[PDB]
Amino acid sequence: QDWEQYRDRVNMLQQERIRDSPLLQAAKENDLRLLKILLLNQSCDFQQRGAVGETALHVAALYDNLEAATLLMEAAPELAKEPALCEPFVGQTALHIAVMNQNLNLVRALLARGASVSARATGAAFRRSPHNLIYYGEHPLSFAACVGSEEIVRLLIEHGADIRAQDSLGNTVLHILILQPNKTFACQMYNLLLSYDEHSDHLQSLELVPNHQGLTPFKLAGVEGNTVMFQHLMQKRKHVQWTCGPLTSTLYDLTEIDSWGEELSFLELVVSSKKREARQILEQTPVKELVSFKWKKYGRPYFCVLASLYILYMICFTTCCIYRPLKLRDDNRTDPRDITILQQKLLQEAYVTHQDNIRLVGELVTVTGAVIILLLEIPDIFRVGASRYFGQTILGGPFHVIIITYASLVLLTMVMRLTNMNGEVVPLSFALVLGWCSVMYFARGFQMLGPFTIMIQKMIFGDLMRFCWLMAVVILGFASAFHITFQTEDPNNLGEFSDYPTALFSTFELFLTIIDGPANYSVDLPFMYCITYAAFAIIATLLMLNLFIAMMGDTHWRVAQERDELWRAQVVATTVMLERKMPRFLWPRSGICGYEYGLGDRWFLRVENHHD
Amino acid sequence: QDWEQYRDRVNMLQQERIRDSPLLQAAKENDLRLLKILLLNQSCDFQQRGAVGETALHVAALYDNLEAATLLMEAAPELAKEPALCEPFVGQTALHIAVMNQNLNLVRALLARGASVSARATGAAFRRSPHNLIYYGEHPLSFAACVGSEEIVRLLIEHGADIRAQDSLGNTVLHILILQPNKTFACQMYNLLLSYDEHSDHLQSLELVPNHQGLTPFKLAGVEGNTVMFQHLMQKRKHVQWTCGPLTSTLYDLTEIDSWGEELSFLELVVSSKKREARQILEQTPVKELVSFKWKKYGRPYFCVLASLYILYMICFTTCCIYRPLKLRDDNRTDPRDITILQQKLLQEAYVTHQDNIRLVGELVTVTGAVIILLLEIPDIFRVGASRYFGQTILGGPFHVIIITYASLVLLTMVMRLTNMNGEVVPLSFALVLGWCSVMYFARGFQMLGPFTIMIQKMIFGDLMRFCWLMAVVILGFASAFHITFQTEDPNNLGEFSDYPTALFSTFELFLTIIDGPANYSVDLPFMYCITYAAFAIIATLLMLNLFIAMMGDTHWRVAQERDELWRAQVVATTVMLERKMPRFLWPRSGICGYEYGLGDRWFLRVENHHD
């Protein structure tokens, strides 16, 4: 069964036992007079529970019923301390339910009895999933903070609610408020929980308490794509120096963005986030002024020096494919089967020559230039995880599938040599169509060439191959029908259709008008040919091509703001990708340090404004 | 004559007799003093009527004239009970006319005399037609309900107006209010007529009273495309279970949408409606949450299993066309008429062979796979009606003309065999260009491939064949003018124009630049050729092709919202089309039933909200 149909059984079987039991019936309906009388004559033993396993007070708190709920707590002393027992609802007590409803007087009544403010709700319907519409955490302080009810929030802290508790995923009360869809109404709540902070607990500040996967609530505001909470967490870390007219020289702290850490870099997590909204943190005023300083000062010359050691490499690999050891044809086997054109095979002559030694040192450059590419890509596979890394389209994208299968086919051609294999022309032709089309990677600078090469990528996955599933059928339709008409005829006159793997290939060419329409006006073609071909020229090359241009012409202004918003996030992905690699010799640390103009040990970045 | 000019005679001949008669003259003009005097001296015998046949009171009520109308009813006792007699105005009494004008005191005066509130207006100008601007039904209660005059509405019910009466089309008072252009102002009226309901008449509820063609006013709110009345009729059939914070788990009834009926399914009538507005019921909140449950759970795997038994069928029919019994050419007739290329004809050799028995069982699959297609399409013709079914473009569309003329040409090729006919290549070439281009039907899932294959259909009916009526003329213009210049010349040098059925076909190819411009630089072409061809290359292949790309390029962003609104109504058409076919083994009935969590016997669907 699906889980969606499993919980629909449980939420409806609960509604049966409320109808069956007379005590639970009056709780929902606020029948006070029954609940006074039915609790006199042996007030019912409260293991009498629903199929979920809840008491009468959980039913009385699930509905807005003050007066019936208080009469149950007077007769029964301990209903505030009982959990539910069904597996998607484990531990949800009456205090978890009264807080959710924002019921002001019922929470006051429950806390007067001493209900535990540290009860976990560990059910399978409270954990975060794409098929649960709420994620409010486990502790009841977290329930009050997410519903925007500030009066219950300050009421629980006065009774012992600890703002430093964590749920099973590790999220504290601050991690959850960033994960809420109501973005602009949690900033009022985040100011409140900092005033209740102990300021005694050394655990360093609550803003720096880590998740299980390592994210602090500052660092989680970036990954989530929360542009409102990012500015709020930055008001603590800027200093205003002077205001001279319209100018204002404010001074940002730059420590939780200038992370000098082994793998938890803030600028890595923002660009490699799967959330679409994370590409807008990169335009906020302490960050946009930073990654346009790394790029224009250092990241642009090191990416133009290194994009011409890769043109001078591929121009050293084609001139060692052209010059390759072809002897003369030492055989007369081309005279049988006059259909064959073939001539001179191969050699083993890198040694005995005057111009295969200049060719030799042009090969060992290409041999030890395809092992360096394997040493800079393979240990970068495991860090991201081999399935995110080949598909992000920003963090490299599908230019790491090409750049490895280029460097793998240079090493095969070495093993095709030194053992005297024959088909050396098969990897050399796959290397040169992939090796040059990887030089197209280095248009990630060059604002001119930049956003164009995304559109090639976006029209080869989205809009070309949905045109090609419905044309592997039309060129199987007509191509297997031209083979039938010319199966009778002679192949010496109009012999484009002589064998069935070329019946498909001549018809795929006729689709593109590359080959002309096959006609011979000195002979009688069969009459069935000119009917099937007058239908092929309307479906294939009026309609199907001129509608593919139109499909290309309207999905290009839909992606108008979206490829240009994606290019500026592809310069930031290049700058952090280089800062892992190049050694500390190159790249002094960004920002003016502060131990000589002595305030501390932090590394600052100065940005001045103009009030328009 | 037209009917439009026939009623213009009658409405103007009526205006003559008002001018001719002195009694009827003063009624329109509110000349009270004449109407007091002219009714003293033998008050005129009221068979004196117009050419339509109306009395003086119908003229007095056709104009807003209280005082003249009351003076006629005092002198003449029975003018409230007289009908008009002309055929487009049969039965329209004075009470039908006073109600239309929203005249408050004149309706009070007529009902005090005892005018019949059940008089039918059976004229030919009150029935529904595209050339009558009003459709208000027949009974006078229906006239008051459509004009938005609530005070006349409650006045007629107090005197005996029956809200359960029907007109000649069968529409009750509730069916008509849905058919009105003033959509948002009849919801106030529909609440009113339910309070006047007897609640004594077993006839089950007035919301379920059928039309003559079977439509209840709920079911008529969907076919008409009335998105406002659909939500109003659904407020009666939803239950709210709980509200937990922003959540709200409401519970829809799902009985008049979950119709388990022989042919009156609600989801069939909405998608096959000719009205354009009916494609917006499929986005309302109890229905959009239903047909995305049938599709994603059951309708998507059964449409991907069954779209690969149709690739593995057409890949079993082409490899029994390629392998077909061609012998060697046992004749030397190709040596006379050396223009002929032909060779080996046919056989009767499915029997004596080692590899025509593997071919034999690949034919009987294709024989009894084109009789199954005939058994699943022919009894579905008569249900929709053979003229709606082949043109809806949503309920299948023109993939049922292809899929029958594919399965018909497999059965001809069987009769071309077994009798030794010759032209077997003529149906095999029509089957393979239609059989594959029917696999393109199965892009009705696959959101990627989905909206693209509508645009092929919309540019083959709308925008290609209005380009082809004005190019059956240009390639008859130039093609019959190239035959004239080369009728003199010799066909062995530049012989594309040697016969008039190829003078058209070489010129149709020259339009598309497929064939090169016919030139031979070693001989003198006639000088008239290079003038007519320098005009052909400007009209045909600068202007006429590059303007067809532009026509394709601007009618594609007009249909931008409209092909994507049409794809989501083409998934709903597939889901209900499959639910007729596949047996009950597959497909338990949708929605949680309710006899175990005992409220009734109805089948419910749970949907929860979030208040933004």
mmCIF file of N, CA and C in Angstrom, chain A residues 2 8-9 12 16 100-101 133-134 136 461 465-467 469-470 473-474 476-478 480-481 483-485 487-490 493 500 516-517 521-524 528 531-532 542-544 546-547 550-551 554 557-558, chain B residues 243-247 297 318 321-322 324 326 339 341-344 425-426 428-430 432-433 436-437 439-440 443 448-449 452-453 455-456 459-460 464 506 509 514 548 552 556-557 560 592-593 596-597 606 608:
data_model
loop_
_atom_site.group_PDB
_atom_site.id
_atom_site.type_symbol
_atom_site.label_atom_id
_atom_site.label_comp_id
_atom_site.label_asym_id
_atom_site.label_seq_id
_atom_site.Cartn_x
_atom_site.Cartn_y
_atom_site.Cartn_z
ATOM 1 N N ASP A 2 0.286 2.366 -0.459
ATOM 2 C CA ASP A 2 0.917 3.661 -0.257
ATOM 3 C C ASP A 2 0.789 4.076 1.201
ATOM 4 N N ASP A 8 -4.899 7.493 5.978
ATOM 5 C CA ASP A 8 -6.311 7.818 5.821
ATOM 6 C C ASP A 8 -7.192 6.772 6.480
ATOM 7 N N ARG A 9 -6.661 5.570 6.694
ATOM 8 C CA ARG A 9 -7.366 4.580 7.497
ATOM 9 C C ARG A 9 -7.380 4.988 8.960
ATOM 10 N N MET A 12 -9.539 8.028 10.068
ATOM 11 C CA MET A 12 -10.975 7.779 10.002
ATOM 12 C C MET A 12 -11.418 6.710 10.986
ATOM 13 N N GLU A 16 -14.392 6.725 14.333
ATOM 14 C CA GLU A 16 -15.418 5.739 14.650
ATOM 15 C C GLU A 16 -15.582 5.587 16.155
ATOM 16 N N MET A 100 -0.789 24.199 19.331
ATOM 17 C CA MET A 100 -1.011 24.318 17.903
ATOM 18 C C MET A 100 -2.245 25.163 17.599
ATOM 19 N N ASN A 101 -3.275 25.032 18.429
ATOM 20 C CA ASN A 101 -4.532 25.713 18.167
ATOM 21 C C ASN A 101 -4.505 27.180 18.554
ATOM 22 N N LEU A 133 2.603 18.579 5.031
ATOM 23 C CA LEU A 133 2.474 20.002 4.748
ATOM 24 C C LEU A 133 3.057 20.885 5.839
ATOM 25 N N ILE A 134 3.395 20.329 6.996
ATOM 26 C CA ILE A 134 4.015 21.095 8.066
ATOM 27 C C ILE A 134 5.299 20.396 8.488
ATOM 28 N N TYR A 136 7.185 21.263 11.944
ATOM 29 C CA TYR A 136 7.270 22.125 13.108
ATOM 30 C C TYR A 136 8.178 21.580 14.191
ATOM 31 N N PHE A 461 18.995 19.452 -24.117
ATOM 32 C CA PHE A 461 18.370 18.561 -23.150
ATOM 33 C C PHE A 461 16.863 18.758 -23.130
ATOM 34 N N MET A 465 15.745 16.925 -27.670
ATOM 35 C CA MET A 465 15.452 15.507 -27.582
ATOM 36 C C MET A 465 13.998 15.220 -27.257
ATOM 37 N N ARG A 466 13.149 16.234 -27.120
ATOM 38 C CA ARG A 466 11.718 15.984 -27.257
ATOM 39 C C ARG A 466 11.252 16.177 -28.686
ATOM 40 N N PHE A 467 12.132 16.629 -29.563
ATOM 41 C CA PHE A 467 11.839 16.629 -30.987
ATOM 42 C C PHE A 467 12.337 15.349 -31.626
ATOM 43 N N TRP A 469 12.389 12.139 -30.061
ATOM 44 C CA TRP A 469 11.577 10.954 -29.809
ATOM 45 C C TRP A 469 10.434 10.839 -30.802
ATOM 46 N N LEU A 470 9.927 11.961 -31.309
ATOM 47 C CA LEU A 470 8.891 11.893 -32.326
ATOM 48 C C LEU A 470 9.442 12.139 -33.709
ATOM 49 N N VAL A 473 10.489 7.963 -35.230
ATOM 50 C CA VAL A 473 9.329 7.241 -35.697
ATOM 51 C C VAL A 473 9.021 7.589 -37.152
ATOM 52 N N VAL A 474 9.151 8.854 -37.537
ATOM 53 C CA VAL A 474 8.863 9.244 -38.912
ATOM 54 C C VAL A 474 9.974 8.782 -39.856
ATOM 55 N N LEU A 476 11.593 6.108 -39.209
ATOM 56 C CA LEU A 476 11.381 4.670 -39.312
ATOM 57 C C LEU A 476 10.127 4.367 -40.094
ATOM 58 N N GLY A 477 9.277 5.369 -40.275
ATOM 59 C CA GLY A 477 8.079 5.150 -41.051
ATOM 60 C C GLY A 477 8.363 5.124 -42.533
ATOM 61 N N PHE A 478 8.979 6.183 -43.032
ATOM 62 C CA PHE A 478 9.196 6.316 -44.458
ATOM 63 C C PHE A 478 10.400 5.512 -44.917
ATOM 64 N N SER A 480 11.493 2.632 -43.850
ATOM 65 C CA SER A 480 11.143 1.241 -44.043
ATOM 66 C C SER A 480 10.042 1.072 -45.063
ATOM 67 N N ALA A 481 9.606 2.158 -45.692
ATOM 68 C CA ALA A 481 8.647 2.067 -46.778
ATOM 69 C C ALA A 481 9.288 2.403 -48.108
ATOM 70 N N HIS A 483 12.358 1.180 -48.598
ATOM 71 C CA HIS A 483 13.055 -0.074 -48.835
ATOM 72 C C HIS A 483 12.140 -1.081 -49.501
ATOM 73 N N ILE A 484 10.830 -0.912 -49.358
ATOM 74 C CA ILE A 484 9.903 -1.886 -49.916
ATOM 75 C C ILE A 484 9.670 -1.607 -51.393
ATOM 76 N N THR A 485 9.653 -0.335 -51.783
ATOM 77 C CA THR A 485 9.401 -0.014 -53.181
ATOM 78 C C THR A 485 10.617 -0.312 -54.048
ATOM 79 N N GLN A 487 12.943 -2.588 -53.353
ATOM 80 C CA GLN A 487 13.515 -3.907 -53.134
ATOM 81 C C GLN A 487 13.479 -4.711 -54.415
ATOM 82 N N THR A 488 12.490 -4.441 -55.253
ATOM 83 C CA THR A 488 12.404 -5.018 -56.580
ATOM 84 C C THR A 488 13.474 -4.480 -57.516
ATOM 85 N N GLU A 489 13.679 -3.167 -57.532
ATOM 86 C CA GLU A 489 14.431 -2.455 -58.556
ATOM 87 C C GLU A 489 15.920 -2.815 -58.519
ATOM 88 N N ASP A 490 16.663 -2.279 -59.479
ATOM 89 C CA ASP A 490 18.089 -2.579 -59.575
ATOM 90 C C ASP A 490 18.898 -1.492 -58.878
ATOM 91 N N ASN A 493 20.798 1.856 -60.666
ATOM 92 C CA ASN A 493 20.056 3.058 -61.023
ATOM 93 C C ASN A 493 19.156 3.426 -59.855
ATOM 94 N N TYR A 500 19.362 -2.199 -45.672
ATOM 95 C CA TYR A 500 18.458 -1.583 -44.710
ATOM 96 C C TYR A 500 19.132 -0.669 -43.681
ATOM 97 N N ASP A 516 19.796 15.511 -51.962
ATOM 98 C CA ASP A 516 18.688 15.866 -52.823
ATOM 99 C C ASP A 516 17.720 14.699 -52.913
ATOM 100 N N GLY A 517 16.489 14.989 -53.311
ATOM 101 C CA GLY A 517 15.496 13.968 -53.533
ATOM 102 C C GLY A 517 15.926 13.019 -54.628
ATOM 103 N N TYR A 521 15.992 10.860 -64.124
ATOM 104 C CA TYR A 521 14.976 11.195 -65.108
ATOM 105 C C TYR A 521 15.148 10.458 -66.423
ATOM 106 N N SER A 522 16.154 9.604 -66.540
ATOM 107 C CA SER A 522 16.325 8.789 -67.730
ATOM 108 C C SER A 522 15.710 7.409 -67.589
ATOM 109 N N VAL A 523 15.124 7.089 -66.435
ATOM 110 C CA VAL A 523 14.534 5.782 -66.178
ATOM 111 C C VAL A 523 13.190 5.937 -65.478
ATOM 112 N N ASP A 524 12.394 4.870 -65.513
ATOM 113 C CA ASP A 524 11.085 4.858 -64.866
ATOM 114 C C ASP A 524 11.219 4.375 -63.431
ATOM 115 N N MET A 528 4.667 4.053 -57.199
ATOM 116 C CA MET A 528 4.447 4.128 -55.764
ATOM 117 C C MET A 528 5.483 5.018 -55.087
ATOM 118 N N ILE A 531 4.256 8.863 -54.906
ATOM 119 C CA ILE A 531 3.181 9.160 -53.963
ATOM 120 C C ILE A 531 3.721 9.222 -52.542
ATOM 121 N N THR A 532 4.543 8.240 -52.159
ATOM 122 C CA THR A 532 5.121 8.213 -50.818
ATOM 123 C C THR A 532 6.104 9.360 -50.616
ATOM 124 N N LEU A 542 8.259 20.398 -44.854
ATOM 125 C CA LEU A 542 7.565 21.652 -44.584
ATOM 126 C C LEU A 542 7.284 21.756 -43.102
ATOM 127 N N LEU A 543 6.522 20.802 -42.581
ATOM 128 C CA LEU A 543 5.957 20.940 -41.249
ATOM 129 C C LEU A 543 7.003 20.736 -40.164
ATOM 130 N N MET A 544 7.711 19.610 -40.191
ATOM 131 C CA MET A 544 8.419 19.173 -38.995
ATOM 132 C C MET A 544 9.703 19.962 -38.763
ATOM 133 N N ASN A 546 10.096 23.337 -39.980
ATOM 134 C CA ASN A 546 9.711 24.721 -39.743
ATOM 135 C C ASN A 546 8.937 24.903 -38.452
ATOM 136 N N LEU A 547 8.513 23.818 -37.815
ATOM 137 C CA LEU A 547 7.936 23.916 -36.487
ATOM 138 C C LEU A 547 8.990 23.740 -35.410
ATOM 139 N N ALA A 550 10.300 27.157 -34.838
ATOM 140 C CA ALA A 550 9.363 27.933 -34.042
ATOM 141 C C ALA A 550 9.422 27.539 -32.572
ATOM 142 N N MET A 551 9.598 26.249 -32.285
ATOM 143 C CA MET A 551 9.818 25.771 -30.922
ATOM 144 C C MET A 551 11.090 26.338 -30.336
ATOM 145 N N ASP A 554 10.389 30.305 -29.475
ATOM 146 C CA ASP A 554 9.566 30.740 -28.359
ATOM 147 C C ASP A 554 10.022 30.220 -27.017
ATOM 148 N N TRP A 557 12.745 33.184 -25.542
ATOM 149 C CA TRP A 557 12.445 34.382 -24.772
ATOM 150 C C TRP A 557 11.731 34.055 -23.473
ATOM 151 N N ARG A 558 11.381 32.790 -23.248
ATOM 152 C CA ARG A 558 11.021 32.367 -21.901
ATOM 153 C C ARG A 558 12.257 32.327 -21.021
ATOM 154 N N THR B 243 -9.227 22.054 12.052
ATOM 155 C CA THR B 243 -8.336 23.140 11.665
ATOM 156 C C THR B 243 -7.204 23.183 12.681
ATOM 157 N N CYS B 244 -5.994 22.849 12.248
ATOM 158 C CA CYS B 244 -4.819 22.771 13.117
ATOM 159 C C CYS B 244 -3.797 23.795 12.651
ATOM 160 N N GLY B 245 -3.907 25.006 13.171
ATOM 161 C CA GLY B 245 -3.048 26.083 12.760
ATOM 162 C C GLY B 245 -3.491 26.674 11.438
ATOM 163 N N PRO B 246 -2.596 26.706 10.453
ATOM 164 C CA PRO B 246 -3.032 27.106 9.115
ATOM 165 C C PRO B 246 -3.693 25.973 8.350
ATOM 166 N N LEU B 247 -3.544 24.726 8.797
ATOM 167 C CA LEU B 247 -4.134 23.599 8.086
ATOM 168 C C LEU B 247 -5.643 23.569 8.257
ATOM 169 N N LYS B 297 -1.166 7.497 -10.089
ATOM 170 C CA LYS B 297 -1.121 6.209 -9.413
ATOM 171 C C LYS B 297 -1.331 5.057 -10.382
ATOM 172 N N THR B 318 7.601 -4.048 -39.589
ATOM 173 C CA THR B 318 8.533 -3.636 -40.634
ATOM 174 C C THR B 318 9.486 -4.755 -40.994
ATOM 175 N N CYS B 321 7.922 -6.695 -43.605
ATOM 176 C CA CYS B 321 7.812 -6.065 -44.910
ATOM 177 C C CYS B 321 9.133 -6.130 -45.657
ATOM 178 N N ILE B 322 10.247 -5.929 -44.948
ATOM 179 C CA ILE B 322 11.575 -6.038 -45.546
ATOM 180 C C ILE B 322 11.796 -7.433 -46.095
ATOM 181 N N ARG B 324 10.297 -10.087 -47.644
ATOM 182 C CA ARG B 324 9.082 -10.451 -48.352
ATOM 183 C C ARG B 324 9.492 -11.223 -49.594
ATOM 184 N N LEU B 326 10.612 -12.015 -52.639
ATOM 185 C CA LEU B 326 11.109 -11.601 -53.944
ATOM 186 C C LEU B 326 12.033 -12.678 -54.492
ATOM 187 N N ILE B 339 14.689 2.328 -70.784
ATOM 188 C CA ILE B 339 14.218 3.223 -69.740
ATOM 189 C C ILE B 339 13.685 2.492 -68.505
ATOM 190 N N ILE B 341 13.851 -0.099 -65.330
ATOM 191 C CA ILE B 341 14.922 -0.635 -64.491
ATOM 192 C C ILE B 341 14.529 -1.967 -63.874
ATOM 193 N N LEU B 342 13.271 -2.378 -64.044
ATOM 194 C CA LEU B 342 12.613 -3.316 -63.143
ATOM 195 C C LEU B 342 13.233 -4.705 -63.180
ATOM 196 N N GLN B 343 12.999 -5.429 -62.097
ATOM 197 C CA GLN B 343 13.518 -6.760 -61.823
ATOM 198 C C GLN B 343 12.458 -7.494 -61.015
ATOM 199 N N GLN B 344 12.889 -8.480 -60.221
ATOM 200 C CA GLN B 344 12.086 -9.580 -59.673
ATOM 201 C C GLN B 344 10.765 -9.452 -58.927
ATOM 202 N N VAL B 425 3.116 -3.646 -53.226
ATOM 203 C CA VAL B 425 3.945 -2.564 -52.725
ATOM 204 C C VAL B 425 3.140 -1.289 -52.523
ATOM 205 N N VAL B 426 1.913 -1.233 -53.027
ATOM 206 C CA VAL B 426 1.083 -0.043 -52.878
ATOM 207 C C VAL B 426 0.431 0.033 -51.491
ATOM 208 N N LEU B 428 1.624 -1.606 -48.750
ATOM 209 C CA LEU B 428 2.702 -1.674 -47.764
ATOM 210 C C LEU B 428 3.400 -0.331 -47.598
ATOM 211 N N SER B 429 3.349 0.527 -48.608
ATOM 212 C CA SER B 429 4.001 1.822 -48.464
ATOM 213 C C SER B 429 3.083 2.833 -47.803
ATOM 214 N N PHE B 430 1.774 2.618 -47.877
ATOM 215 C CA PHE B 430 0.845 3.478 -47.159
ATOM 216 C C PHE B 430 0.695 3.044 -45.711
ATOM 217 N N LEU B 432 3.206 1.884 -43.814
ATOM 218 C CA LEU B 432 4.390 2.165 -43.015
ATOM 219 C C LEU B 432 4.586 3.657 -42.811
ATOM 220 N N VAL B 433 3.945 4.491 -43.625
ATOM 221 C CA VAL B 433 4.068 5.917 -43.376
ATOM 222 C C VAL B 433 2.966 6.381 -42.448
ATOM 223 N N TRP B 436 3.828 4.159 -38.413
ATOM 224 C CA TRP B 436 4.756 4.773 -37.480
ATOM 225 C C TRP B 436 4.250 6.121 -37.014
ATOM 226 N N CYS B 437 3.751 6.966 -37.919
ATOM 227 C CA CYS B 437 3.222 8.271 -37.513
ATOM 228 C C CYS B 437 1.962 8.194 -36.650
ATOM 229 N N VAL B 439 2.510 6.083 -33.842
ATOM 230 C CA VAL B 439 3.209 5.900 -32.567
ATOM 231 C C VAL B 439 3.372 7.243 -31.878
ATOM 232 N N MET B 440 3.328 8.322 -32.644
ATOM 233 C CA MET B 440 3.337 9.687 -32.148
ATOM 234 C C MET B 440 2.095 10.031 -31.321
ATOM 235 N N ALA B 443 2.629 10.271 -27.153
ATOM 236 C CA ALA B 443 3.219 11.364 -26.408
ATOM 237 C C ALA B 443 2.177 12.157 -25.638
ATOM 238 N N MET B 448 7.395 16.536 -21.049
ATOM 239 C CA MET B 448 8.379 16.898 -22.055
ATOM 240 C C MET B 448 7.817 16.853 -23.475
ATOM 241 N N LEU B 449 7.391 15.676 -23.926
ATOM 242 C CA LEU B 449 6.914 15.472 -25.290
ATOM 243 C C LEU B 449 5.477 15.917 -25.507
ATOM 244 N N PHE B 452 4.254 19.562 -27.344
ATOM 245 C CA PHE B 452 4.854 19.728 -28.654
ATOM 246 C C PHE B 452 3.996 19.107 -29.741
ATOM 247 N N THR B 453 3.451 17.911 -29.513
ATOM 248 C CA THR B 453 2.714 17.247 -30.580
ATOM 249 C C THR B 453 1.311 17.799 -30.792
ATOM 250 N N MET B 455 1.173 21.133 -31.295
ATOM 251 C CA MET B 455 1.547 22.233 -32.168
ATOM 252 C C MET B 455 1.781 21.747 -33.591
ATOM 253 N N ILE B 456 2.180 20.486 -33.747
ATOM 254 C CA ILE B 456 2.234 19.877 -35.071
ATOM 255 C C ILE B 456 0.835 19.772 -35.657
ATOM 256 N N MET B 459 -0.489 23.351 -36.531
ATOM 257 C CA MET B 459 0.142 23.956 -37.695
ATOM 258 C C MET B 459 0.027 23.098 -38.937
ATOM 259 N N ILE B 460 -0.825 22.075 -38.921
ATOM 260 C CA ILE B 460 -1.084 21.312 -40.135
ATOM 261 C C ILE B 460 -2.506 21.564 -40.602
ATOM 262 N N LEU B 464 -0.533 25.618 -42.234
ATOM 263 C CA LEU B 464 0.080 25.049 -43.424
ATOM 264 C C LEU B 464 -0.867 25.103 -44.604
ATOM 265 N N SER B 506 9.048 18.660 -60.938
ATOM 266 C CA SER B 506 10.356 19.295 -60.823
ATOM 267 C C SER B 506 10.235 20.706 -60.280
ATOM 268 N N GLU B 509 9.719 20.710 -56.567
ATOM 269 C CA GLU B 509 10.981 20.494 -55.879
ATOM 270 C C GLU B 509 11.863 21.737 -55.916
ATOM 271 N N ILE B 514 15.362 21.787 -53.065
ATOM 272 C CA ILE B 514 15.828 20.414 -52.955
ATOM 273 C C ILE B 514 16.606 20.062 -54.207
ATOM 274 N N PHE B 548 6.835 32.135 -44.761
ATOM 275 C CA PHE B 548 6.181 31.019 -44.100
ATOM 276 C C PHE B 548 6.845 30.678 -42.782
ATOM 277 N N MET B 552 4.957 31.009 -39.167
ATOM 278 C CA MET B 552 5.081 29.979 -38.156
ATOM 279 C C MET B 552 5.621 30.574 -36.864
ATOM 280 N N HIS B 556 2.966 31.052 -33.045
ATOM 281 C CA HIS B 556 3.409 30.097 -32.045
ATOM 282 C C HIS B 556 3.463 30.725 -30.660
ATOM 283 N N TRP B 557 3.574 32.049 -30.570
ATOM 284 C CA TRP B 557 3.457 32.642 -29.246
ATOM 285 C C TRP B 557 2.065 33.190 -28.992
ATOM 286 N N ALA B 560 0.433 30.091 -26.813
ATOM 287 C CA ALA B 560 1.460 29.857 -25.813
ATOM 288 C C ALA B 560 0.867 29.373 -24.506
ATOM 289 N N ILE B 592 -11.794 6.884 -0.552
ATOM 290 C CA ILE B 592 -12.012 6.078 0.642
ATOM 291 C C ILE B 592 -13.504 5.926 0.860
ATOM 292 N N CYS B 593 -13.972 4.690 0.995
ATOM 293 C CA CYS B 593 -15.392 4.454 1.199
ATOM 294 C C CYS B 593 -15.757 4.639 2.666
ATOM 295 N N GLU B 596 -17.690 1.229 6.621
ATOM 296 C CA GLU B 596 -17.027 0.802 7.849
ATOM 297 C C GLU B 596 -16.916 1.954 8.831
ATOM 298 N N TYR B 597 -16.482 3.208 8.495
ATOM 299 C CA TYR B 597 -16.460 4.408 9.487
ATOM 300 C C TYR B 597 -17.713 5.188 9.274
ATOM 301 N N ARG B 606 -10.271 12.967 0.556
ATOM 302 C CA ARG B 606 -9.796 13.917 1.554
ATOM 303 C C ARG B 606 -8.746 14.861 0.981
ATOM 304 N N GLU B 608 -6.566 18.516 2.138
ATOM 305 C CA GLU B 608 -6.285 19.493 3.185
ATOM 306 C C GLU B 608 -5.590 20.722 2.613
#
